[PDB]
Design a protein around this nucleic acid. Sequence first.
RNA 1: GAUGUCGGCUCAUCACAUCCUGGGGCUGAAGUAGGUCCCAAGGGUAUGGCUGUUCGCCAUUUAAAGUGGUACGCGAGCUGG
RNA 2: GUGAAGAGGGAAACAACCCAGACCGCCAGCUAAGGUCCCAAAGUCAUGGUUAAGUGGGAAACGAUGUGGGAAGGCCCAGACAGCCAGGAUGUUGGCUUAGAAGCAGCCAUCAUUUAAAGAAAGCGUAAUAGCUCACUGGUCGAGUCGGCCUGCGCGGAAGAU
Lengths: 94, 141, 136, 176, 38
Amino acid sequence: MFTINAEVRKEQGKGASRRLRAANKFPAIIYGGKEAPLAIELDHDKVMNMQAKAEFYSEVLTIVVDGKEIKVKAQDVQRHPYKPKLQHIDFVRA
Amino acid sequence: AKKVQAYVKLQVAAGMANPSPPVGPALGQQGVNIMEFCKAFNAKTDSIEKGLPIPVVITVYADRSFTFVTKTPPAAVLLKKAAGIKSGSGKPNKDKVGKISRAQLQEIAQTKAADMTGADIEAMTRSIEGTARSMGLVVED
Amino acid sequence: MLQPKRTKFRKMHKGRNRGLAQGTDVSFGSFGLKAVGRGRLTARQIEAARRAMTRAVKRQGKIWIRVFPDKPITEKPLAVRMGKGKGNVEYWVALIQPGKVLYEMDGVPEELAREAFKLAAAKLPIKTTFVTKTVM
Amino acid sequence: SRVAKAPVVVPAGVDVKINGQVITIKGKNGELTRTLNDAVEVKHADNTLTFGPRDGYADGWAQAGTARALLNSMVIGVTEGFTKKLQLVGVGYRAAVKGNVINLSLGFSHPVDHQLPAGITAECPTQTEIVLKGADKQVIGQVAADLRAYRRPEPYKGKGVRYADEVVRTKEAKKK
Amino acid sequence: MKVRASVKKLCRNCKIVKRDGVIRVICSAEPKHKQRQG
RNA sequence: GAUGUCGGCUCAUCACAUCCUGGGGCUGAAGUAGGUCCCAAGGGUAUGGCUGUUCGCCAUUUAAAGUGGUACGCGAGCUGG
RNA sequence: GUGAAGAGGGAAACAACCCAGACCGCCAGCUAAGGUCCCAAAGUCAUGGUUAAGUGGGAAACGAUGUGGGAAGGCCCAGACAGCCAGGAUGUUGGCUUAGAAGCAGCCAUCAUUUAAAGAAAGCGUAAUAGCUCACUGGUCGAGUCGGCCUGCGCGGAAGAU
């Protein structure tokens, strides 16, 4: 369990994505069921240390987005391919 | 070096207290006297069992005098006797080469009792059990 | 050097390719070395690395092999004017990319694995970095 | 941190001058210091010769923790002598004493000598030993080194002018 | 001293002293573990 | 629409990854000379037999007979093997 | 794409790189690339930060309490971290090998007890024991502290011929 701070992301395309990550904010989506997908941006540094622990991949996460909460599980995790740094994480609702 | 304290502990069997080198030049230097110690020692070893080195604790004094308490034969040796194979246990805990019953451990713990630490006879028995397990002599009683 | 046990062609282009590989992370062992650099391994390097690894982890560990040389590439000896004919296979290279997994240990401590990999790479030229599978 | 935040002390029978960055004590049994610091802030009390981190630095508090112990070590540099023996393995090395010369040799044709500085007093009755007993912990320590640095203990014998410790092992001589 | 470009560890009494821009080793247990640089 | 090849002789000059001398560290450093590695270009760095060889091998010395560059230094200086 | 067949401005100068295509004149003005401490035209500019090697101004494997920034973790007044007082006991100088290797040549044990703590042991020493010291642990001390991680800038590694 990690209760994690994120917010909506309305910035799309590779250019914006790259830009975002330098400010410690990496893209991500919540999706699950037939509910609308929520394109969010979690905080890099926070999630980086959390995902290092196995708790992340195997317990209910609660991403507080815009004063609401969404109960998800971290499904896929698209890391940097030679750094422990992230670039994206797919979340499938719990 | 060959510096040594006056409260030495050593194991010697009979006739191996006669030479100075296997006890070391070290404690030979002190007020304990090789000759004196030998004949005194070898007298008392006849009554007790022997086969492997026997632990004697010498307390040396500075007047060229000494006193010694010759302890009863080791826990290891006694366990070997019980197990029926003696002259070491080879390399322990890589083979089995004895069996030791609960009864044997209790007997050995009472005889060695004087020189041992332990809350109870039970405590001491466990100490001897640990020596059996260390000699590779199983306890399955 | 080390070479294939089966082939279909006996000469190959040097080959220029971009970074990234599909095998980015361990999928068997709980430890690994991935790549940070890129280049080509002559194959005496792969031989030295295997050697050094084994002597440390002993028979306690469990081994998996990735990176296979299969591109031959020729070398023309000295005293031969270049671009008149083509040389003889005296290379057996494995083109490597960032994130390319080398070996994979399991059944050992994390510390022991690090100091078998430390001995391995150091006879591999590129900078490497430790992998911990975790649960993914 | 630690030393650099521990309180400085000026012991009784010792006195200090008003200085900008110099450390100079006065009195007797503590009356020689001349050391400089270059990131201290020399402030005063009535028993604390205080030091702080000077402007334009961010590691000037290193110099303050220095200055603390450095003051206190030349209070007791004058009060207490140092190098109260300085022995030697090996024969024919010996010494002589003239109360301000102290001879030494390793078996040399001519003895080497140290004319002790002013304010440094030395004599010894033992002629394989050098006893210094002068002023200032640093001063003494320099002259001390010059003695032993001619020949040092060896790691198979131990021959050579020692001080108060030796490094020696029982390595096996070859050609035997 | 003796040029060795990797400090490593050789004894617990290897102090590992950085004197100038080099990192030498002074070791008072064994003088064999000394090295010029690092 | 010509920059004489190599080697020697003769005359050198510079660099140091130093052969010798000077100063050290470590040594399995008994002494003794050494071994190894570091600093050091100030100066110093063999004559003959065979071979055009540079080079090499051999003989006998010396503190040592270093290594490389300088058009594999130097033929508008010599020789022409 | 340029030079070829293009000058000019910049790259110390340097056909091929960068900027920009010279009808001609005018001791006119505005910009580009590129610059603004002096030689040498214009900021010793403003704001904030980093760096002490003259780094910048040649280098990698690799090595290092160098130093700045960030996040997390371990430990902390129920006393950490350094130092200092100690404990360093007993079965057991345990067994193989060796006359004697009995923690510490090699090989094996590496258990159990005494307890606030005390390995049948890390090295010196002895063929090897004996001894000396020690990772191990309690008290005193009195306030922050220990290693990894991401990341910026430095350091060593870095020897040549006028």
